[PDB]
Design an enzyme around this catalytic site. Structure first.
Site, PDB file in Angstrom:
ATOM      1  N   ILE A  89       0.785  -1.202   0.000  1.00  0.00           N
ATOM      2  CA  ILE A  89       0.000   0.000   0.000  1.00  0.00           C
ATOM      3  C   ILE A  89       0.828   1.269   0.000  1.00  0.00           C
ATOM      4  CG2 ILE A  89      -2.031  -1.130   0.995  1.00  0.00           C
ATOM      5  CD1 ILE A  89      -1.335  -0.114   3.671  1.00  0.00           C
ATOM      6  N   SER A 140       5.180   2.928  -0.593  1.00  0.00           N
ATOM      7  CA  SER A 140       6.583   2.647  -0.872  1.00  0.00           C
ATOM      8  C   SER A 140       7.367   3.933  -0.861  1.00  0.00           C
ATOM      9  CB  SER A 140       6.771   1.950  -2.191  1.00  0.00           C
ATOM     10  OG  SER A 140       8.118   1.523  -2.302  1.00  0.00           O
ATOM     11  N   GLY A 141       8.653   3.813  -0.604  1.00  0.00           N
ATOM     12  CA  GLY A 141       9.464   5.001  -0.542  1.00  0.00           C
ATOM     13  C   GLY A 141      10.897   4.575  -0.607  1.00  0.00           C
ATOM     14  N   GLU A 142      11.754   5.521  -0.253  1.00  0.00           N
ATOM     15  CA  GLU A 142      13.187   5.325  -0.224  1.00  0.00           C
ATOM     16  C   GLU A 142      13.443   5.048   1.227  1.00  0.00           C
ATOM     17  N   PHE A 143      12.357   4.717   1.897  1.00  0.00           N
ATOM     18  CA  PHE A 143      12.352   4.402   3.309  1.00  0.00           C
ATOM     19  C   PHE A 143      11.734   3.000   3.481  1.00  0.00           C
ATOM     20  N   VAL A 199       5.204  -0.349   2.824  1.00  0.00           N
ATOM     21  CA  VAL A 199       4.138  -0.590   3.821  1.00  0.00           C
ATOM     22  C   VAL A 199       3.164  -1.588   3.197  1.00  0.00           C
ATOM     23  CG1 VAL A 199       2.288   0.463   5.172  1.00  0.00           C
ATOM     24  CG2 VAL A 199       4.346   1.775   4.621  1.00  0.00           C
ATOM     25  N   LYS A 232       4.976  -1.434   8.178  1.00  0.00           N
ATOM     26  CA  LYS A 232       6.064  -0.817   7.417  1.00  0.00           C
ATOM     27  C   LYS A 232       7.302  -1.648   7.639  1.00  0.00           C
ATOM     28  CE  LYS A 232       8.155   2.941   8.539  1.00  0.00           C
ATOM     29  NZ  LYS A 232       9.529   3.347   8.937  1.00  0.00           N
ATOM     30  N   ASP A 282       6.258  16.860   9.453  1.00  0.00           N
ATOM     31  CA  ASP A 282       6.015  16.471   8.054  1.00  0.00           C
ATOM     32  C   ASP A 282       4.541  16.293   7.745  1.00  0.00           C
ATOM     33  OD1 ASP A 282       7.144  13.768   5.879  1.00  0.00           O
ATOM     34  OD2 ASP A 282       6.911  15.882   5.378  1.00  0.00           O
TER      35      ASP A 282
HETATM   36  O1  LIG Z   1       0.524   3.656   9.618  1.00  0.00           O
HETATM   37  C1  LIG Z   1      -0.281   3.482   8.652  1.00  0.00           C
HETATM   38  N1  LIG Z   1      -1.587   3.162   8.832  1.00  0.00           N
HETATM   39  C2  LIG Z   1      -2.106   3.109   7.593  1.00  0.00           C
HETATM   40  O2  LIG Z   1      -3.297   2.725   7.412  1.00  0.00           O
HETATM   41  C3  LIG Z   1      -1.130   3.421   6.561  1.00  0.00           C
HETATM   42  C4  LIG Z   1       0.097   3.713   7.247  1.00  0.00           C
HETATM   43  C5  LIG Z   1       1.332   4.052   6.545  1.00  0.00           C
HETATM   44  C6  LIG Z   1       2.604   4.325   7.229  1.00  0.00           C
HETATM   45  C7  LIG Z   1       3.128   3.354   8.114  1.00  0.00           C
HETATM   46  C8  LIG Z   1       4.361   3.579   8.778  1.00  0.00           C
HETATM   47  C9  LIG Z   1       5.076   4.715   8.410  1.00  0.00           C
HETATM   48  C10 LIG Z   1       4.593   5.626   7.501  1.00  0.00           C
HETATM   49  C11 LIG Z   1       3.342   5.452   6.871  1.00  0.00           C
HETATM   50  C12 LIG Z   1       1.243   4.179   5.125  1.00  0.00           C
HETATM   51  C13 LIG Z   1       0.022   3.953   4.458  1.00  0.00           C
HETATM   52  N2  LIG Z   1      -0.318   3.985   3.138  1.00  0.00           N
HETATM   53  C14 LIG Z   1      -1.610   3.620   2.904  1.00  0.00           C
HETATM   54  C15 LIG Z   1      -2.369   3.554   1.728  1.00  0.00           C
HETATM   55  C16 LIG Z   1      -3.709   3.157   1.841  1.00  0.00           C
HETATM   56  C17 LIG Z   1      -4.363   2.875   3.085  1.00  0.00           C
HETATM   57  O3  LIG Z   1      -5.639   2.551   3.013  1.00  0.00           O
HETATM   58  C18 LIG Z   1      -3.645   2.991   4.300  1.00  0.00           C
HETATM   59  C19 LIG Z   1      -2.275   3.344   4.173  1.00  0.00           C
HETATM   60  C20 LIG Z   1      -1.198   3.538   5.136  1.00  0.00           C
END
Ligand SMILES: O=C1NC(=O)c2c1c(-c1ccccc1)cc1[nH]c3ccc(O)cc3c21
Ligand SMILES: [Mg+2]
Ligand SMILES: [Mg+2]
EC number: 2.7.10.2
Length: 259
Positions: free
Chosen positions: A15, A17-20, A23, A38, A136
């Site tokens: 769901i 993606s990054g340079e980190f 997820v 993640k 951020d």
């Molecule tokens: O913590 C999260 N809870 C989430 O539901 C989530 C998270 C993250 C995320 C997780 C850890 C670090 C940074 C972002 C990214 C994410 N991209 C997403 C894209 C679609 C979605 O429905 C949920 C997420 C999402």
């Protein structure tokens, strides 16, 4: 191998993606619930990068009781990876809702913008009460779950009086932070939240630099393709005031008459 990740969870799909790292939406086998996990490459122990990676975990470990911050469940290391298991928000990111709205020419209306601003504002008031700052705030870090908005991505969180900070997204960055002046960090989160609401109101994609970037920092709101009450527009304007002391605190924002 036989990872904790593999044994405890069924991975459904990627769901983010990054340079980190990435997820994934996963189902925990024992409890049946869906989480967002993640999974990122593990930094060299004792490195600045590891300190930064651990801040995220420590920030999550203390910001887990608020309705407008994504909840944390667990974190662990295995292999060459660190993992963080958070609440899954099934409504996707604010960024994606804004992109869909852009294409359909139907944006968040004033009542909905006020709801977004109040909800994330409460989330900010909680983070700030913990002597922490997010650093951020932007639509791709706000998630949707009555609609509920929740602040996620704690990867730039640091204490409010930190002498060192890692700069958040250039498009939402207040000038004073760019100038290395960290005397009013919480007001940087306020400035980014106002621009986040501007994006939800239907504005063109924000400038990363150049002349339009400086103009916004002079306190000029980007054009918004809908008519908003003067009182609400004035609140967004004061939230991007060049003087961080003029911007409202998160507590003042949540108690604001307009909201
Ligand atoms: O913590 C999260 N809870 C989430 O539901 C989530 C998270 C993250 C995320 C997780 C850890 C670090 C940074 C972002 C990214 C994410 N991209 C997403 C894209 C679609 C979605 O429905 C949920 C997420 C999402
Ligand atoms: Mg992010
Ligand atoms: Mg960090």
């Amino acid at each position: 191998m036989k990872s904790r990740y593999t044994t405890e969870f069924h991975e459904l799909e990627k769901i983010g993606s990054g340079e980190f790292g990435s997820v994934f939406k996963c189902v925990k086998r024992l409890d049946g619930c869906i989480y967002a996990i993640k999974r990122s490459k593990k930094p060299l122990a004792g490195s600045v990068d590891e300190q930064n990676a651990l801040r995220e975990v420590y920030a999550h470990a203390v910001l887990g009781q608020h309705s407008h911050v994504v909840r944390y469940f667990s974190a662990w290391a295995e292999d060459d990876h660190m993992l963080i298991q958070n609440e899954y928000c099934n409504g996707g990111s604010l960024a994606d809702a804004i992109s869909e709205n852009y294409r359909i020419m139907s944006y968040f209306k004033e009542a909905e913008l006020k709801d977004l601003l109040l909800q994330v504002g409460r989330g900010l008031r909680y983070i700030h009460s913990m002597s922490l700052v997010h650093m951020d705030i932007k639509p791709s870090n706000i998630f949707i779950s009555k609609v509920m908005f929740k602040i996620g991505d704690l990867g730039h969180v640091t204490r409010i009086s930190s002498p060192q900070v890692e700069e958040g997204d250039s498009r939402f960055l207040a000038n004073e932070v760019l100038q290395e002046n960290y005397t009013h960090l919480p007001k940087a989160d306020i400035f980014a939240l106002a621009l986040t609401v501007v994006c939800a109101a239907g504005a063109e994609p924000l400038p990363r630099n150049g002349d339009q970037w400086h103009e916004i920092r002079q306190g000029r709101l980007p054009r918004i393709p809908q008519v908003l009450s003067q009182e609400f527009t004035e609140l967004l304007k004061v939230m991007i005031h060049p003087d961080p002391e003029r911007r409202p605190s998160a507590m003042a924002l949540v108690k604001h008459s307009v909201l």
